[PDB]
Design an enzyme around this catalytic site. Structure first.
Site, PDB file in Angstrom:
ATOM      1  N   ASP A 182       0.796  -1.208   0.000  1.00 14.28           N
ATOM      2  CA  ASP A 182       0.000   0.000   0.000  1.00 14.28           C
ATOM      3  C   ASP A 182       0.842   1.279   0.000  1.00 14.28           C
ATOM      4  OD1 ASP A 182       1.074  -0.161   2.543  1.00 14.28           O
ATOM      5  OD2 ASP A 182      -0.947  -0.237   3.520  1.00 14.28           O
ATOM      6  N   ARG A 238      -4.257   5.734   5.109  1.00  8.62           N
ATOM      7  CA  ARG A 238      -4.624   5.234   3.795  1.00  8.62           C
ATOM      8  C   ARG A 238      -5.593   6.192   3.109  1.00  8.62           C
ATOM      9  NH1 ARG A 238      -4.418  -0.422   3.040  1.00  8.62           N
ATOM     10  NH2 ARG A 238      -6.106   0.268   1.671  1.00  8.62           N
ATOM     11  N   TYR A 259      -0.452  -2.129  11.546  1.00  8.30           N
ATOM     12  CA  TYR A 259       0.444  -3.265  11.681  1.00  8.30           C
ATOM     13  C   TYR A 259       0.661  -3.569  13.162  1.00  8.30           C
ATOM     14  CZ  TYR A 259       2.018  -2.963   6.780  1.00  8.30           C
ATOM     15  OH  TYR A 259       2.080  -2.934   5.413  1.00  8.30           O
ATOM     16  N   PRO A 278       8.268  -5.439   6.683  1.00  4.39           N
ATOM     17  CA  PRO A 278       7.500  -4.197   6.699  1.00  4.39           C
ATOM     18  C   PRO A 278       8.249  -2.989   7.261  1.00  4.39           C
ATOM     19  CG  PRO A 278       6.161  -6.052   7.506  1.00  4.39           C
ATOM     20  CD  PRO A 278       7.577  -6.550   7.344  1.00  4.39           C
TER      21      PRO A 278
END
Ligand SMILES: Cc1cc2nc3c(=O)[nH]c(=O)nc-3n(C[C@H](O)[C@H](O)[C@H](O)COP(=O)(O)OP(=O)(O)OC[C@H]3O[C@@H](n4cnc5c(N)ncnc54)[C@H](O)[C@@H]3O)c2cc1C
Ligand SMILES: Cc1cc2nc3c(=O)[nH]c(=O)nc-3n(C[C@H](O)[C@H](O)[C@H](O)COP(=O)(O)OP(=O)(O)OC[C@H]3O[C@@H](n4cnc5c(N)ncnc54)[C@H](O)[C@@H]3O)c2cc1C
Lengths: 602, 602
Positions: free
Chosen positions: A49, A240, A248, A327
């Site tokens: 993303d 987002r 996360y 990540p």
């Protein structure tokens, strides 16, 4: 029902980020390309993303950034919350998400993977290419014949495809003979396994809970990248599109293993539970979901690199198929997409007969080293970057000086701007002196110039599209000085003379290969576009000036920024992927000739 | 056989610039609108070429500027050529095309009429509206009944339409009963004639040849707006998309009159001849066409204004149907498009029952005055601006000081930014003192602010879209000072109280009518979005700060720019068309209430 037998120049296996970048780039260059995927429908949600600054620049080169910036959230600001005197969290600091003052777009942008892919798929469709699905490879055979392997017009890869949902009456098997094949089929690449290539590195996989939600929250920094360490545990916010965020949450082996039969059991951890953990970690701030989960997963992820990124330069692998990142490494799909941005122009050139097949060796050389550098840096230095504050003398066993250097390097890895390719056929590190800022092997440095013809300003990057052409930037110097004007004219004769590199490698229409631009160190008041030699103004738009736009809002200071002596000038070659390939003085055409000679075919 | 009888809220006659601006605006606001045109298919080319700065801002308010800027040529620079002492033309000066340091986009852009219309038509189609064609009105009846004329839900306009090419099976006649009708049917408006409305002004029409070509030319300023006076005559270059230019060539009465019988014979002028005239005018530079004519016409054009721009506020006219401007006036279709940008939100509000029908009187008041002001200025002062250089003492009977003032005014007419609406129901000129730069009746002045939540910078214009809402900008002052924070909170309770203007005129969902934004005079270091009163953060994005983006590239200095005392603050009301309607102090909400009371229905 006899299996169908076909040919193709390039077959791509997998329609994820790497896959679609490649398919689009090849389609826009008019290459005969097919791309398959085993999933019956496209991914709708979640997964990767984040898009990095350099990747935005790359999409810009394809005309795709405009749409990205219109649809995507801007992750501009990062915040750090840590355990408070009173219990649970307080904010300790904030900072720019991205530390990179070169960058044209000094921030990340976030958007779900479905929507990122769409930008590429819609472009692909417009250029006559669609994902064929659902299809899997079942077999991959490769020619013994060295002569066939080295022949860019042979089809030595035979890939057998099985259609998982064929139209009734017709065969479930196609045998595709391909000139080149690419495995963009993710961390579990069928292609990699078929090629017999190992994934080297730590065997430890780590576990992350991920939930995308529409937050019900009084948390002030809900629109920042936020690292939250509480007494109860860590998590991180990725804002987002719209009001959505991603959380996360790092998990333990314990949370996912079966108390009895000691097997990895993902059903032990639910999104409801992940959110309950977050709720605790955000205290005293609230955190809930307005409408369940837009998406969730248990992301299991390790860091490894394939031992090889091609076999015989005829089958390649890209993205997660040949390297994975945690990540916290901040890479998401960005290195994956830059792998195929690197590959495609090179495949394109080989197929058009413009480049010797050996140029494709540079793919592995460039991209595999970068992947190793990322993971080598993560192993050595990732302990510094959890987002707990540096409190101590020589904390984590590194000094202030070493910490600052590592935070700088890290910033260059995450921005995507740090990428520095080593010398090769397509990277000649010579004459660096002449433009010390335009590091050879690094991407062309953003600065604004102005067209002589119409006074419109352009970032140099906008005149360096991904059009499969090399760009020759001829910095002419102070063109108003008669001596330097005569010099410019002499160089133009030289480049356009019949035996020059331009014509010898230009295949009857050299402007299809080589995009020539002038950048003169004078102002529009003193230079009309017609003042330049014809070869330096093949179109009126090729005449740039180191000067401001008409309202003195942008432009000027370009020669100074780049480190170019305005009295001497320089030739700067930019590759189709926007990386600087070499530099040479105005009298050093022979070194430009040598550049192209190391990889172009006559 | 029997004619079809239908209804509609708004019927638009003519699908040119004014027409499509209106149709799109109404479609985006969900209004029931139909639009017709007598041309069987959409035009590929026409008059419109040039879009002014303010018009770009307006398209931006619809989300349409991005596409315009992607497709259109930038006319950034103007040049002036004039007869040389020796013979032939020489360049006397160059300058910015536009004189407007406010402007967000300080240039014009050019593009063929077909492609400009397309931007609007494709937006219309996405919102369920298509031009019906080929269709003409044959009759227009209007009700006697005062009660019907004043009732915004009656349908007093009966327009009879003839289909010029009807589908077999159907009738060729439709009688549309409409609430409102708009004539956007050009200089020879059938609507205007039907309404019995005169066009007042000079009787003299002037004659221009127009040719669009791909130039074969060594003229250095071919990509500039160029005024050329030769011994042989005047013409002007308007650079267009790609390599194309348009040439306007001034002609004489004699060039279209019959040397014998002195009758108007337009066939005496061919594009071949117009190009031959250009050839001569450009000497010593060359000028020819690479490939015939993209397009051409004989533009016959006078300057006039309709005596009325509506009948009973039920049938309106717009654009060339109610005012025309010479090419040298630099308006092209820009005032036409800004006419319907003015009208549509007002029609919208009447239909939604948000505004009294009388508000539509402001259309004529605002737009007819602007048209008169343009032509009054052109008659007085256009002698100064043929593009001949000021050589003499007190040339054309005006001093240097008076010339400079006129050039300034002229620049404000051509930019579109000068538009200053006089006091009315929707323009209350009070408290100007408190933000002297935000002239009431003029368009909201561009400046960059930064969101508290995520640090993203936005020009204020980007938070003032054409969404049919009024915008209340609450400049809160130094929100970090307890006293001024208490003040902010007090004002928020006042605005959200049950008897306030917001609720009393908000029709059960006030946020559909009124967009409330905060702009606090502090930095993000000191203000999280949650620090503001709830009413000033109805969404997290409503909290703006007078501060820079994170890289200090844009923003800051907003209160200073606007002339607002950071210690006191102000309320600025912006109309749906982006013009400032009024200003009031933070203690003066009664004046805001009075504003809306002069035209809104409860
Ligand atoms: C369940 C899940 C959760 C994830 N969560 C995250 C996350 O939270 N954060 C994050 O950064 N990334 C996450 N990702 C991964 C993210 O998509 C990758 O990190 C990144 O997109 C790698 O890109 P790639 O270009 O290598 O290809 P991928 O994105 O892996 O694309 C691979 C494609 O190949 C197809 N494919 C696989 N095998 C075959 C075959 N044999 N034949 C044909 N097609 C085949 C697949 O259907 C898929 O569409 C997640 C992935 C999955 C599957
Ligand atoms: C053939 C032609 C050539 C032109 N050439 C030039 C030029 O070279 N340079 C220049 O500067 N200006 C030119 N113009 C003027 C130009 O049309 C406008 O100034 C501009 O394009 C937009 O203003 P507008 O929106 O008010 O109207 P318009 O573009 O006029 O929109 C309405 C159009 O609809 C059509 N129409 C007419 N009556 C009806 C009706 N009853 N029902 C439905 N449709 C109808 C007409 O063709 C009319 O042009 C030209 C006009 C025409 C008709």
């Amino acid at each position: 029902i006899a299996p169908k037998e076909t040919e193709v120049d390039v077959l791509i296996v997998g329609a994820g980020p790497a896959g679609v970048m490649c398919a689009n780039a090849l389609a826009m260059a008019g290459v005969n390309v097919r791309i398959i995927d085993q999933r019956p429908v496209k991914v709708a949600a979640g997964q990767a993303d984040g898009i990095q600054p350099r990747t935005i620049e790359v999409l810009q080169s394809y005309g795709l950034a405009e749409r990205l910036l219109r649809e995507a959230n801007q992750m501009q600001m990062a915040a750090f919350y840590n355990p408070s005197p009173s219990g649970g969290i307080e904010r300790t600091s904030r900072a720019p998400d991205v530390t990179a003052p070169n960058a044209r777009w000094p921030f990340e942008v976030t958007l779900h993977q479905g929507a990122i892919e769409a930008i590429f798929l819609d472009s692909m469709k417009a250029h006559g290419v669609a994902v064929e699905r659902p299809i899997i490879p079942t077999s991959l055979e490769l020619s013994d014949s060295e002569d066939e392997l080295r022949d860019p017009n042979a089809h030595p890869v035979k890939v057998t495809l099985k259609y998982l949902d064929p139209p009734a009456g017709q065969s479930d098997t196609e045998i595709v003979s391909a000139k080149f094949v690419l495995g963009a089929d993710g961390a579990h690449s069928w292609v990699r396994k078929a090629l017999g290539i190992t994934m080297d590195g730590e065997q430890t996989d780590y576990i992350w809970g991920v939930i995308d939600i529409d937050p019900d929250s009084d948390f002030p920094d809900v629109r920042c990248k936020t690292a939250v360490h509480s007494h109860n545990g860590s998590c991180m916010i990725i804002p987002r599109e719209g009001d959505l965020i991603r959380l996360y949450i790092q998990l333990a082996d314990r949370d996912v293993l079966d108390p009895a039969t000691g097997r990895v059991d993902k059903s032990r951890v639910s999104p409801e539970k992940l959110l309950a953990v977050a709720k605790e970690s955000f205290k005293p701030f609230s955190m809930g979901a307005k409408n369940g989960f837009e998406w969730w997963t248990l992301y299991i992820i390790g860091q490894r690199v394939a031992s090889r990124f091609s076999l015989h330069e005829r089958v390649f692998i890209a993205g997660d198929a040949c390297h994975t990142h945690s990540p916290k490494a901040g890479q998401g799909m960005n290195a994956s997409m830059n792998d195929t941005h690197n590959l495609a122009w090179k495949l394109t050139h080989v197929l058009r007969g413009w480049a010797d097949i050996s140029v494709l060796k540079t793919y592995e050389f460039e991209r595999r080293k970068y992947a190793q550098d990322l993971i080598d840096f993560d192993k050595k230095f990732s302990k510094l970057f959890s987002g707990k504050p540096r409190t101590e003398d020589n904390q984590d066993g590194v000094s202030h000086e070493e910490f600052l250097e590592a935070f700088q390097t890290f910033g260059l890895f995450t921005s995507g701007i740090g990428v520095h390719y080593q010398p090769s056929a397509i990277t000649h590190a010579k004459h660096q002196d002449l433009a010390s800022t335009l590091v050879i092997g690094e991407r062309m440095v953003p600065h604004v110039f102005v067209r002589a013809a119409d006074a419109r300003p352009y970032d140099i990057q906008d005149v360096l599209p991904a059009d499969a052409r090399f760009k020759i930037l001829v910095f002419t110097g102070v063109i108003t000085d008669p001596a330097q004007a005569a010099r410019a004219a002499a160089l133009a004769e030289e480049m356009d003379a019949p035996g020059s590199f331009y014509h010898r490698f230009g295949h009857e229409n050299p402007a299809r290969v080589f995009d020539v631009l002038s950048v003169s160190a004078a102002k529009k008041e003193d230079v009309n576009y017609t003042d330049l030699p014809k070869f330096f103004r093949q179109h009126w738009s090729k005449v740039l000036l180191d000067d401001t736009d008409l309202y003195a809002r942008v432009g000027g200071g370009g020669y100074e920024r780049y480190g170019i002596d305005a009295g001497k000038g320089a030739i700067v070659v930019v590759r189709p992927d926007g990386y600087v390939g070499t530099i040479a003085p105005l009298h050093g055409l022979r070194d430009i000739d040598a550049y192209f000679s190391a990889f172009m075919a006559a």
